[PDB]
Amino acid sequence: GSCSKEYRVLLGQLQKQTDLMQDTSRLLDPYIRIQGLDVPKLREHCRERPGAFPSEETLRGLGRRGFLQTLNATLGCVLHRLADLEQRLPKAQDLERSGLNIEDLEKLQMARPNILGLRNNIYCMAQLLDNASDAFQRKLEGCRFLHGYHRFMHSVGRVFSKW
């Protein structure tokens, strides 16, 4: 929350956190598992949705404050989509009977707190700058959405590494 800040330390925190969030084993994979999508043929159908997320090229074209603003607005949309996905996710009390893993649900529950933490650091940095479908189909969209989110964070970590 608080904004204890020396520019280089904060930037180090942002580089570290964003480079970590690109890792598909943290959200996308447990998601595929807990929704029963972990079968080879279905997996290939979990690819990013073209235009769902800003390209690395658009992100690089932005300029410092613009980058933070676009990043922050996107994470906003992500938190909302995530809140929606989470409500439709199997409930902890039904996992055993359905043969699912509580560890996958626990990993998935870190998504929101992690993103809020990143958003807080983004605001602190901004302060340092001088200025339809059935249920089956919906699970697949969740798939594609998370895949796009991880690729997006990858692009984001790349822009930060050159800060």
PDB file of N, CA and C in Angstrom, residues 42-144:
ATOM      1  N   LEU A  42      -7.648 -30.667 -26.375  1.00  0.00           N
ATOM      2  CA  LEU A  42      -8.325 -29.454 -25.920  1.00  0.00           C
ATOM      3  C   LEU A  42      -7.340 -28.350 -25.610  1.00  0.00           C
ATOM      4  N   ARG A  43      -6.233 -28.723 -24.984  1.00  0.00           N
ATOM      5  CA  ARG A  43      -5.199 -27.761 -24.633  1.00  0.00           C
ATOM      6  C   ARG A  43      -4.807 -26.819 -25.773  1.00  0.00           C
ATOM      7  N   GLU A  44      -4.527 -27.347 -26.961  1.00  0.00           N
ATOM      8  CA  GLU A  44      -4.169 -26.472 -28.069  1.00  0.00           C
ATOM      9  C   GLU A  44      -5.239 -25.403 -28.306  1.00  0.00           C
ATOM     10  N   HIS A  45      -6.473 -25.654 -27.871  1.00  0.00           N
ATOM     11  CA  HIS A  45      -7.549 -24.671 -28.062  1.00  0.00           C
ATOM     12  C   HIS A  45      -7.561 -23.540 -27.014  1.00  0.00           C
ATOM     13  N   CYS A  46      -6.511 -23.452 -26.209  1.00  0.00           N
ATOM     14  CA  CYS A  46      -6.406 -22.412 -25.200  1.00  0.00           C
ATOM     15  C   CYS A  46      -5.451 -21.309 -25.597  1.00  0.00           C
ATOM     16  N   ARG A  47      -5.508 -20.863 -26.842  1.00  0.00           N
ATOM     17  CA  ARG A  47      -4.582 -19.826 -27.248  1.00  0.00           C
ATOM     18  C   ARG A  47      -5.160 -18.426 -27.107  1.00  0.00           C
ATOM     19  N   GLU A  48      -4.287 -17.440 -26.914  1.00  0.00           N
ATOM     20  CA  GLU A  48      -4.694 -16.047 -26.757  1.00  0.00           C
ATOM     21  C   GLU A  48      -5.702 -15.627 -27.810  1.00  0.00           C
ATOM     22  N   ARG A  49      -6.585 -14.704 -27.449  1.00  0.00           N
ATOM     23  CA  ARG A  49      -7.593 -14.184 -28.368  1.00  0.00           C
ATOM     24  C   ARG A  49      -6.968 -12.973 -29.083  1.00  0.00           C
ATOM     25  N   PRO A  50      -6.838 -13.026 -30.424  1.00  0.00           N
ATOM     26  CA  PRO A  50      -6.244 -11.872 -31.107  1.00  0.00           C
ATOM     27  C   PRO A  50      -6.960 -10.570 -30.740  1.00  0.00           C
ATOM     28  N   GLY A  51      -6.173  -9.567 -30.345  1.00  0.00           N
ATOM     29  CA  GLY A  51      -6.728  -8.273 -29.978  1.00  0.00           C
ATOM     30  C   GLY A  51      -7.302  -8.193 -28.570  1.00  0.00           C
ATOM     31  N   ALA A  52      -7.211  -9.286 -27.814  1.00  0.00           N
ATOM     32  CA  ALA A  52      -7.729  -9.249 -26.452  1.00  0.00           C
ATOM     33  C   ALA A  52      -6.785  -8.398 -25.620  1.00  0.00           C
ATOM     34  N   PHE A  53      -5.497  -8.484 -25.901  1.00  0.00           N
ATOM     35  CA  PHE A  53      -4.567  -7.697 -25.116  1.00  0.00           C
ATOM     36  C   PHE A  53      -3.582  -6.920 -25.964  1.00  0.00           C
ATOM     37  N   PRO A  54      -3.140  -5.748 -25.465  1.00  0.00           N
ATOM     38  CA  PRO A  54      -2.186  -4.867 -26.134  1.00  0.00           C
ATOM     39  C   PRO A  54      -0.929  -5.641 -26.489  1.00  0.00           C
ATOM     40  N   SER A  55      -0.434  -5.411 -27.701  1.00  0.00           N
ATOM     41  CA  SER A  55       0.766  -6.069 -28.196  1.00  0.00           C
ATOM     42  C   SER A  55       2.002  -5.472 -27.532  1.00  0.00           C
ATOM     43  N   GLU A  56       3.116  -6.202 -27.545  1.00  0.00           N
ATOM     44  CA  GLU A  56       4.369  -5.675 -27.008  1.00  0.00           C
ATOM     45  C   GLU A  56       4.755  -4.373 -27.760  1.00  0.00           C
ATOM     46  N   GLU A  57       4.511  -4.366 -29.078  1.00  0.00           N
ATOM     47  CA  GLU A  57       4.807  -3.227 -29.965  1.00  0.00           C
ATOM     48  C   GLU A  57       4.001  -1.987 -29.590  1.00  0.00           C
ATOM     49  N   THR A  58       2.725  -2.153 -29.306  1.00  0.00           N
ATOM     50  CA  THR A  58       1.932  -1.022 -28.853  1.00  0.00           C
ATOM     51  C   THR A  58       2.498  -0.545 -27.485  1.00  0.00           C
ATOM     52  N   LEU A  59       2.727  -1.472 -26.554  1.00  0.00           N
ATOM     53  CA  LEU A  59       3.266  -1.139 -25.226  1.00  0.00           C
ATOM     54  C   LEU A  59       4.621  -0.389 -25.345  1.00  0.00           C
ATOM     55  N   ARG A  60       5.490  -0.822 -26.263  1.00  0.00           N
ATOM     56  CA  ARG A  60       6.778  -0.150 -26.437  1.00  0.00           C
ATOM     57  C   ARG A  60       6.582   1.230 -27.071  1.00  0.00           C
ATOM     58  N   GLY A  61       5.589   1.360 -27.924  1.00  0.00           N
ATOM     59  CA  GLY A  61       5.377   2.660 -28.539  1.00  0.00           C
ATOM     60  C   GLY A  61       4.890   3.760 -27.614  1.00  0.00           C
ATOM     61  N   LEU A  62       4.454   3.390 -26.403  1.00  0.00           N
ATOM     62  CA  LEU A  62       3.848   4.334 -25.457  1.00  0.00           C
ATOM     63  C   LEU A  62       4.521   5.439 -24.633  1.00  0.00           C
ATOM     64  N   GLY A  63       5.765   5.404 -24.300  1.00  0.00           N
ATOM     65  CA  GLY A  63       6.080   6.546 -23.432  1.00  0.00           C
ATOM     66  C   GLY A  63       5.799   6.118 -21.976  1.00  0.00           C
ATOM     67  N   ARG A  64       6.587   6.613 -21.034  1.00  0.00           N
ATOM     68  CA  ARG A  64       6.495   6.216 -19.634  1.00  0.00           C
ATOM     69  C   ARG A  64       5.136   6.261 -18.890  1.00  0.00           C
ATOM     70  N   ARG A  65       4.514   7.416 -18.816  1.00  0.00           N
ATOM     71  CA  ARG A  65       3.229   7.529 -18.123  1.00  0.00           C
ATOM     72  C   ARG A  65       2.135   6.765 -18.887  1.00  0.00           C
ATOM     73  N   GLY A  66       2.156   6.842 -20.218  1.00  0.00           N
ATOM     74  CA  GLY A  66       1.161   6.144 -21.039  1.00  0.00           C
ATOM     75  C   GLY A  66       1.229   4.631 -20.809  1.00  0.00           C
ATOM     76  N   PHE A  67       2.453   4.140 -20.652  1.00  0.00           N
ATOM     77  CA  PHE A  67       2.634   2.739 -20.426  1.00  0.00           C
ATOM     78  C   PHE A  67       2.005   2.341 -19.092  1.00  0.00           C
ATOM     79  N   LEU A  68       2.300   3.092 -18.041  1.00  0.00           N
ATOM     80  CA  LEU A  68       1.731   2.804 -16.738  1.00  0.00           C
ATOM     81  C   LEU A  68       0.220   2.867 -16.764  1.00  0.00           C
ATOM     82  N   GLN A  69      -0.332   3.873 -17.460  1.00  0.00           N
ATOM     83  CA  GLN A  69      -1.778   4.052 -17.569  1.00  0.00           C
ATOM     84  C   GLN A  69      -2.476   2.912 -18.308  1.00  0.00           C
ATOM     85  N   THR A  70      -1.890   2.469 -19.421  1.00  0.00           N
ATOM     86  CA  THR A  70      -2.461   1.387 -20.206  1.00  0.00           C
ATOM     87  C   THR A  70      -2.341   0.085 -19.444  1.00  0.00           C
ATOM     88  N   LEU A  71      -1.211  -0.080 -18.779  1.00  0.00           N
ATOM     89  CA  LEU A  71      -0.985  -1.279 -17.998  1.00  0.00           C
ATOM     90  C   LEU A  71      -2.015  -1.346 -16.866  1.00  0.00           C
ATOM     91  N   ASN A  72      -2.203  -0.220 -16.202  1.00  0.00           N
ATOM     92  CA  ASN A  72      -3.109  -0.161 -15.094  1.00  0.00           C
ATOM     93  C   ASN A  72      -4.561  -0.352 -15.488  1.00  0.00           C
ATOM     94  N   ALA A  73      -4.950   0.180 -16.648  1.00  0.00           N
ATOM     95  CA  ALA A  73      -6.326   0.047 -17.132  1.00  0.00           C
ATOM     96  C   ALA A  73      -6.564  -1.417 -17.553  1.00  0.00           C
ATOM     97  N   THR A  74      -5.556  -2.033 -18.177  1.00  0.00           N
ATOM     98  CA  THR A  74      -5.715  -3.423 -18.585  1.00  0.00           C
ATOM     99  C   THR A  74      -5.899  -4.326 -17.361  1.00  0.00           C
ATOM    100  N   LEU A  75      -5.070  -4.129 -16.336  1.00  0.00           N
ATOM    101  CA  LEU A  75      -5.152  -4.944 -15.123  1.00  0.00           C
ATOM    102  C   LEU A  75      -6.522  -4.727 -14.524  1.00  0.00           C
ATOM    103  N   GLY A  76      -7.084  -3.530 -14.703  1.00  0.00           N
ATOM    104  CA  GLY A  76      -8.423  -3.265 -14.173  1.00  0.00           C
ATOM    105  C   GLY A  76      -9.434  -4.209 -14.840  1.00  0.00           C
ATOM    106  N   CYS A  77      -9.378  -4.270 -16.170  1.00  0.00           N
ATOM    107  CA  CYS A  77     -10.245  -5.141 -16.946  1.00  0.00           C
ATOM    108  C   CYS A  77      -9.955  -6.611 -16.558  1.00  0.00           C
ATOM    109  N   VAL A  78      -8.699  -6.923 -16.275  1.00  0.00           N
ATOM    110  CA  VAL A  78      -8.362  -8.278 -15.891  1.00  0.00           C
ATOM    111  C   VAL A  78      -8.993  -8.649 -14.541  1.00  0.00           C
ATOM    112  N   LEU A  79      -8.916  -7.745 -13.561  1.00  0.00           N
ATOM    113  CA  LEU A  79      -9.501  -8.012 -12.259  1.00  0.00           C
ATOM    114  C   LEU A  79     -10.976  -8.310 -12.419  1.00  0.00           C
ATOM    115  N   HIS A  80     -11.660  -7.543 -13.268  1.00  0.00           N
ATOM    116  CA  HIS A  80     -13.097  -7.760 -13.497  1.00  0.00           C
ATOM    117  C   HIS A  80     -13.410  -9.085 -14.191  1.00  0.00           C
ATOM    118  N   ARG A  81     -12.651  -9.421 -15.215  1.00  0.00           N
ATOM    119  CA  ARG A  81     -12.864 -10.692 -15.904  1.00  0.00           C
ATOM    120  C   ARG A  81     -12.566 -11.833 -14.939  1.00  0.00           C
ATOM    121  N   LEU A  82     -11.541 -11.642 -14.122  1.00  0.00           N
ATOM    122  CA  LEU A  82     -11.137 -12.646 -13.160  1.00  0.00           C
ATOM    123  C   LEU A  82     -12.225 -12.870 -12.117  1.00  0.00           C
ATOM    124  N   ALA A  83     -12.829 -11.784 -11.642  1.00  0.00           N
ATOM    125  CA  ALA A  83     -13.877 -11.875 -10.633  1.00  0.00           C
ATOM    126  C   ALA A  83     -14.991 -12.733 -11.234  1.00  0.00           C
ATOM    127  N   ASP A  84     -15.293 -12.486 -12.507  1.00  0.00           N
ATOM    128  CA  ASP A  84     -16.321 -13.234 -13.223  1.00  0.00           C
ATOM    129  C   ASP A  84     -15.970 -14.712 -13.358  1.00  0.00           C
ATOM    130  N   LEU A  85     -14.739 -15.025 -13.785  1.00  0.00           N
ATOM    131  CA  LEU A  85     -14.301 -16.431 -13.912  1.00  0.00           C
ATOM    132  C   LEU A  85     -14.364 -17.169 -12.585  1.00  0.00           C
ATOM    133  N   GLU A  86     -13.900 -16.500 -11.538  1.00  0.00           N
ATOM    134  CA  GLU A  86     -13.849 -17.080 -10.202  1.00  0.00           C
ATOM    135  C   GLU A  86     -15.202 -17.454  -9.627  1.00  0.00           C
ATOM    136  N   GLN A  87     -16.234 -16.697  -9.964  1.00  0.00           N
ATOM    137  CA  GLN A  87     -17.559 -17.002  -9.453  1.00  0.00           C
ATOM    138  C   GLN A  87     -18.072 -18.316 -10.064  1.00  0.00           C
ATOM    139  N   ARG A  88     -17.669 -18.599 -11.299  1.00  0.00           N
ATOM    140  CA  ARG A  88     -18.110 -19.796 -12.001  1.00  0.00           C
ATOM    141  C   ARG A  88     -17.197 -20.991 -11.810  1.00  0.00           C
ATOM    142  N   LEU A  89     -16.172 -20.831 -10.991  1.00  0.00           N
ATOM    143  CA  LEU A  89     -15.218 -21.903 -10.770  1.00  0.00           C
ATOM    144  C   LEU A  89     -15.759 -22.919  -9.735  1.00  0.00           C
ATOM    145  N   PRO A  90     -15.369 -24.189  -9.874  1.00  0.00           N
ATOM    146  CA  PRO A  90     -15.841 -25.193  -8.910  1.00  0.00           C
ATOM    147  C   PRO A  90     -15.541 -24.686  -7.491  1.00  0.00           C
ATOM    148  N   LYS A  91     -16.477 -24.900  -6.563  1.00  0.00           N
ATOM    149  CA  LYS A  91     -16.332 -24.479  -5.153  1.00  0.00           C
ATOM    150  C   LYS A  91     -15.465 -25.456  -4.323  1.00  0.00           C
ATOM    151  N   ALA A  92     -14.662 -24.907  -3.407  1.00  0.00           N
ATOM    152  CA  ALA A  92     -13.765 -25.703  -2.581  1.00  0.00           C
ATOM    153  C   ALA A  92     -14.431 -26.925  -1.966  1.00  0.00           C
ATOM    154  N   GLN A  93     -15.665 -26.782  -1.493  1.00  0.00           N
ATOM    155  CA  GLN A  93     -16.329 -27.920  -0.862  1.00  0.00           C
ATOM    156  C   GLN A  93     -16.717 -29.036  -1.832  1.00  0.00           C
ATOM    157  N   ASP A  94     -16.755 -28.755  -3.127  1.00  0.00           N
ATOM    158  CA  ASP A  94     -17.104 -29.804  -4.098  1.00  0.00           C
ATOM    159  C   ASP A  94     -15.924 -30.407  -4.855  1.00  0.00           C
ATOM    160  N   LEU A  95     -14.712 -29.917  -4.601  1.00  0.00           N
ATOM    161  CA  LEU A  95     -13.556 -30.410  -5.344  1.00  0.00           C
ATOM    162  C   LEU A  95     -13.288 -31.902  -5.212  1.00  0.00           C
ATOM    163  N   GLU A  96     -13.252 -32.410  -3.985  1.00  0.00           N
ATOM    164  CA  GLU A  96     -12.989 -33.831  -3.804  1.00  0.00           C
ATOM    165  C   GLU A  96     -13.978 -34.733  -4.595  1.00  0.00           C
ATOM    166  N   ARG A  97     -15.278 -34.508  -4.424  1.00  0.00           N
ATOM    167  CA  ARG A  97     -16.285 -35.316  -5.106  1.00  0.00           C
ATOM    168  C   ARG A  97     -16.119 -35.216  -6.631  1.00  0.00           C
ATOM    169  N   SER A  98     -15.649 -34.076  -7.130  1.00  0.00           N
ATOM    170  CA  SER A  98     -15.460 -33.900  -8.571  1.00  0.00           C
ATOM    171  C   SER A  98     -14.084 -34.348  -9.020  1.00  0.00           C
ATOM    172  N   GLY A  99     -13.263 -34.811  -8.075  1.00  0.00           N
ATOM    173  CA  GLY A  99     -11.925 -35.262  -8.429  1.00  0.00           C
ATOM    174  C   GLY A  99     -10.914 -34.144  -8.712  1.00  0.00           C
ATOM    175  N   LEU A 100     -11.178 -32.934  -8.240  1.00  0.00           N
ATOM    176  CA  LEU A 100     -10.290 -31.798  -8.488  1.00  0.00           C
ATOM    177  C   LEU A 100      -9.359 -31.519  -7.303  1.00  0.00           C
ATOM    178  N   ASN A 101      -8.324 -30.716  -7.543  1.00  0.00           N
ATOM    179  CA  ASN A 101      -7.254 -30.402  -6.583  1.00  0.00           C
ATOM    180  C   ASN A 101      -7.351 -28.996  -5.901  1.00  0.00           C
ATOM    181  N   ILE A 102      -7.410 -28.995  -4.567  1.00  0.00           N
ATOM    182  CA  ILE A 102      -7.527 -27.755  -3.817  1.00  0.00           C
ATOM    183  C   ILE A 102      -6.294 -26.897  -4.096  1.00  0.00           C
ATOM    184  N   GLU A 103      -5.143 -27.505  -4.362  1.00  0.00           N
ATOM    185  CA  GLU A 103      -3.984 -26.669  -4.628  1.00  0.00           C
ATOM    186  C   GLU A 103      -4.204 -25.820  -5.885  1.00  0.00           C
ATOM    187  N   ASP A 104      -4.903 -26.346  -6.889  1.00  0.00           N
ATOM    188  CA  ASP A 104      -5.176 -25.562  -8.095  1.00  0.00           C
ATOM    189  C   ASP A 104      -6.069 -24.388  -7.749  1.00  0.00           C
ATOM    190  N   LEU A 105      -7.040 -24.595  -6.858  1.00  0.00           N
ATOM    191  CA  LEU A 105      -7.928 -23.474  -6.520  1.00  0.00           C
ATOM    192  C   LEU A 105      -7.161 -22.401  -5.687  1.00  0.00           C
ATOM    193  N   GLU A 106      -6.252 -22.840  -4.819  1.00  0.00           N
ATOM    194  CA  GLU A 106      -5.450 -21.942  -3.991  1.00  0.00           C
ATOM    195  C   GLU A 106      -4.553 -21.055  -4.855  1.00  0.00           C
ATOM    196  N   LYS A 107      -3.896 -21.665  -5.847  1.00  0.00           N
ATOM    197  CA  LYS A 107      -3.062 -20.897  -6.763  1.00  0.00           C
ATOM    198  C   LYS A 107      -3.925 -19.827  -7.428  1.00  0.00           C
ATOM    199  N   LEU A 108      -5.112 -20.230  -7.883  1.00  0.00           N
ATOM    200  CA  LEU A 108      -6.014 -19.312  -8.588  1.00  0.00           C
ATOM    201  C   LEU A 108      -6.464 -18.164  -7.708  1.00  0.00           C
ATOM    202  N   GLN A 109      -6.516 -18.395  -6.407  1.00  0.00           N
ATOM    203  CA  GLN A 109      -6.940 -17.339  -5.518  1.00  0.00           C
ATOM    204  C   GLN A 109      -5.868 -16.295  -5.248  1.00  0.00           C
ATOM    205  N   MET A 110      -4.630 -16.570  -5.642  1.00  0.00           N
ATOM    206  CA  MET A 110      -3.542 -15.576  -5.500  1.00  0.00           C
ATOM    207  C   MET A 110      -3.663 -14.515  -6.620  1.00  0.00           C
ATOM    208  N   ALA A 111      -4.322 -14.851  -7.718  1.00  0.00           N
ATOM    209  CA  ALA A 111      -4.381 -13.903  -8.839  1.00  0.00           C
ATOM    210  C   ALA A 111      -4.785 -12.476  -8.473  1.00  0.00           C
ATOM    211  N   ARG A 112      -5.882 -12.333  -7.757  1.00  0.00           N
ATOM    212  CA  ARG A 112      -6.366 -11.007  -7.410  1.00  0.00           C
ATOM    213  C   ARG A 112      -5.407 -10.233  -6.463  1.00  0.00           C
ATOM    214  N   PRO A 113      -4.989 -10.838  -5.336  1.00  0.00           N
ATOM    215  CA  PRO A 113      -4.074 -10.146  -4.412  1.00  0.00           C
ATOM    216  C   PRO A 113      -2.756  -9.756  -5.115  1.00  0.00           C
ATOM    217  N   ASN A 114      -2.225 -10.643  -5.940  1.00  0.00           N
ATOM    218  CA  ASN A 114      -0.990 -10.323  -6.667  1.00  0.00           C
ATOM    219  C   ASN A 114      -1.171  -9.108  -7.594  1.00  0.00           C
ATOM    220  N   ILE A 115      -2.251  -9.116  -8.369  1.00  0.00           N
ATOM    221  CA  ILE A 115      -2.500  -8.027  -9.300  1.00  0.00           C
ATOM    222  C   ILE A 115      -2.748  -6.710  -8.540  1.00  0.00           C
ATOM    223  N   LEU A 116      -3.457  -6.762  -7.403  1.00  0.00           N
ATOM    224  CA  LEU A 116      -3.681  -5.538  -6.597  1.00  0.00           C
ATOM    225  C   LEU A 116      -2.316  -5.007  -6.115  1.00  0.00           C
ATOM    226  N   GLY A 117      -1.429  -5.922  -5.706  1.00  0.00           N
ATOM    227  CA  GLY A 117      -0.096  -5.526  -5.260  1.00  0.00           C
ATOM    228  C   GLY A 117       0.665  -4.815  -6.396  1.00  0.00           C
ATOM    229  N   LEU A 118       0.554  -5.363  -7.607  1.00  0.00           N
ATOM    230  CA  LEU A 118       1.222  -4.758  -8.746  1.00  0.00           C
ATOM    231  C   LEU A 118       0.609  -3.395  -8.993  1.00  0.00           C
ATOM    232  N   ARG A 119      -0.723  -3.318  -8.984  1.00  0.00           N
ATOM    233  CA  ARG A 119      -1.383  -2.025  -9.194  1.00  0.00           C
ATOM    234  C   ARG A 119      -0.925  -0.964  -8.165  1.00  0.00           C
ATOM    235  N   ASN A 120      -0.741  -1.348  -6.894  1.00  0.00           N
ATOM    236  CA  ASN A 120      -0.248  -0.396  -5.885  1.00  0.00           C
ATOM    237  C   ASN A 120       1.146   0.105  -6.274  1.00  0.00           C
ATOM    238  N   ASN A 121       2.011  -0.784  -6.763  1.00  0.00           N
ATOM    239  CA  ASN A 121       3.361  -0.337  -7.113  1.00  0.00           C
ATOM    240  C   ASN A 121       3.352   0.559  -8.360  1.00  0.00           C
ATOM    241  N   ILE A 122       2.369   0.348  -9.203  1.00  0.00           N
ATOM    242  CA  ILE A 122       2.280   1.125 -10.405  1.00  0.00           C
ATOM    243  C   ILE A 122       1.913   2.530 -10.042  1.00  0.00           C
ATOM    244  N   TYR A 123       1.031   2.673  -9.056  1.00  0.00           N
ATOM    245  CA  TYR A 123       0.585   3.995  -8.615  1.00  0.00           C
ATOM    246  C   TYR A 123       1.785   4.685  -7.940  1.00  0.00           C
ATOM    247  N   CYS A 124       2.503   3.949  -7.121  1.00  0.00           N
ATOM    248  CA  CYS A 124       3.637   4.607  -6.477  1.00  0.00           C
ATOM    249  C   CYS A 124       4.592   5.126  -7.534  1.00  0.00           C
ATOM    250  N   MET A 125       4.823   4.351  -8.605  1.00  0.00           N
ATOM    251  CA  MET A 125       5.769   4.775  -9.668  1.00  0.00           C
ATOM    252  C   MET A 125       5.252   5.989 -10.417  1.00  0.00           C
ATOM    253  N   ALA A 126       3.953   5.979 -10.689  1.00  0.00           N
ATOM    254  CA  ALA A 126       3.269   7.064 -11.359  1.00  0.00           C
ATOM    255  C   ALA A 126       3.508   8.339 -10.532  1.00  0.00           C
ATOM    256  N   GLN A 127       3.511   8.209  -9.192  1.00  0.00           N
ATOM    257  CA  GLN A 127       3.770   9.348  -8.309  1.00  0.00           C
ATOM    258  C   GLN A 127       5.244   9.835  -8.418  1.00  0.00           C
ATOM    259  N   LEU A 128       6.149   8.989  -8.900  1.00  0.00           N
ATOM    260  CA  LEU A 128       7.572   9.375  -9.016  1.00  0.00           C
ATOM    261  C   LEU A 128       7.864  10.015 -10.360  1.00  0.00           C
ATOM    262  N   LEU A 129       7.000   9.792 -11.342  1.00  0.00           N
ATOM    263  CA  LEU A 129       7.222  10.367 -12.657  1.00  0.00           C
ATOM    264  C   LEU A 129       6.943  11.867 -12.631  1.00  0.00           C
ATOM    265  N   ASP A 130       7.807  12.619 -13.293  1.00  0.00           N
ATOM    266  CA  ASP A 130       7.669  14.065 -13.371  1.00  0.00           C
ATOM    267  C   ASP A 130       6.672  14.383 -14.460  1.00  0.00           C
ATOM    268  N   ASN A 131       5.512  14.898 -14.069  1.00  0.00           N
ATOM    269  CA  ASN A 131       4.469  15.226 -15.036  1.00  0.00           C
ATOM    270  C   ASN A 131       3.429  16.224 -14.500  1.00  0.00           C
ATOM    271  N   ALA A 132     -25.212 -16.505 -24.695  1.00  0.00           N
ATOM    272  CA  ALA A 132     -24.259 -16.459 -25.805  1.00  0.00           C
ATOM    273  C   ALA A 132     -23.570 -17.814 -25.985  1.00  0.00           C
ATOM    274  N   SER A 133     -22.736 -18.167 -25.011  1.00  0.00           N
ATOM    275  CA  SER A 133     -22.002 -19.424 -25.029  1.00  0.00           C
ATOM    276  C   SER A 133     -22.474 -20.319 -23.887  1.00  0.00           C
ATOM    277  N   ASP A 134     -22.451 -21.637 -24.089  1.00  0.00           N
ATOM    278  CA  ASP A 134     -22.827 -22.535 -23.010  1.00  0.00           C
ATOM    279  C   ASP A 134     -21.657 -22.632 -22.016  1.00  0.00           C
ATOM    280  N   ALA A 135     -21.819 -23.429 -20.957  1.00  0.00           N
ATOM    281  CA  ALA A 135     -20.773 -23.520 -19.937  1.00  0.00           C
ATOM    282  C   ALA A 135     -19.472 -24.093 -20.433  1.00  0.00           C
ATOM    283  N   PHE A 136     -19.559 -24.999 -21.395  1.00  0.00           N
ATOM    284  CA  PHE A 136     -18.372 -25.626 -21.933  1.00  0.00           C
ATOM    285  C   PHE A 136     -17.559 -24.572 -22.656  1.00  0.00           C
ATOM    286  N   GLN A 137     -18.250 -23.815 -23.496  1.00  0.00           N
ATOM    287  CA  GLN A 137     -17.610 -22.781 -24.283  1.00  0.00           C
ATOM    288  C   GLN A 137     -17.026 -21.696 -23.375  1.00  0.00           C
ATOM    289  N   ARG A 138     -17.700 -21.394 -22.278  1.00  0.00           N
ATOM    290  CA  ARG A 138     -17.200 -20.357 -21.391  1.00  0.00           C
ATOM    291  C   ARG A 138     -15.898 -20.765 -20.702  1.00  0.00           C
ATOM    292  N   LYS A 139     -15.737 -22.051 -20.419  1.00  0.00           N
ATOM    293  CA  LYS A 139     -14.501 -22.524 -19.789  1.00  0.00           C
ATOM    294  C   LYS A 139     -13.358 -22.268 -20.777  1.00  0.00           C
ATOM    295  N   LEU A 140     -13.593 -22.599 -22.040  1.00  0.00           N
ATOM    296  CA  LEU A 140     -12.584 -22.386 -23.078  1.00  0.00           C
ATOM    297  C   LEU A 140     -12.202 -20.905 -23.220  1.00  0.00           C
ATOM    298  N   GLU A 141     -13.171 -19.992 -23.159  1.00  0.00           N
ATOM    299  CA  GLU A 141     -12.879 -18.558 -23.220  1.00  0.00           C
ATOM    300  C   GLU A 141     -11.996 -18.167 -21.999  1.00  0.00           C
ATOM    301  N   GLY A 142     -12.287 -18.734 -20.823  1.00  0.00           N
ATOM    302  CA  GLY A 142     -11.467 -18.460 -19.648  1.00  0.00           C
ATOM    303  C   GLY A 142     -10.012 -18.810 -19.939  1.00  0.00           C
ATOM    304  N   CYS A 143      -9.844 -19.947 -20.606  1.00  0.00           N
ATOM    305  CA  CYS A 143      -8.581 -20.524 -21.050  1.00  0.00           C
ATOM    306  C   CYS A 143      -7.794 -19.531 -21.891  1.00  0.00           C
ATOM    307  N   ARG A 144      -8.477 -19.086 -22.931  1.00  0.00           N
ATOM    308  CA  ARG A 144      -7.873 -18.190 -23.874  1.00  0.00           C
ATOM    309  C   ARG A 144      -7.569 -16.876 -23.217  1.00  0.00           C
TER     310      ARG A 144
END
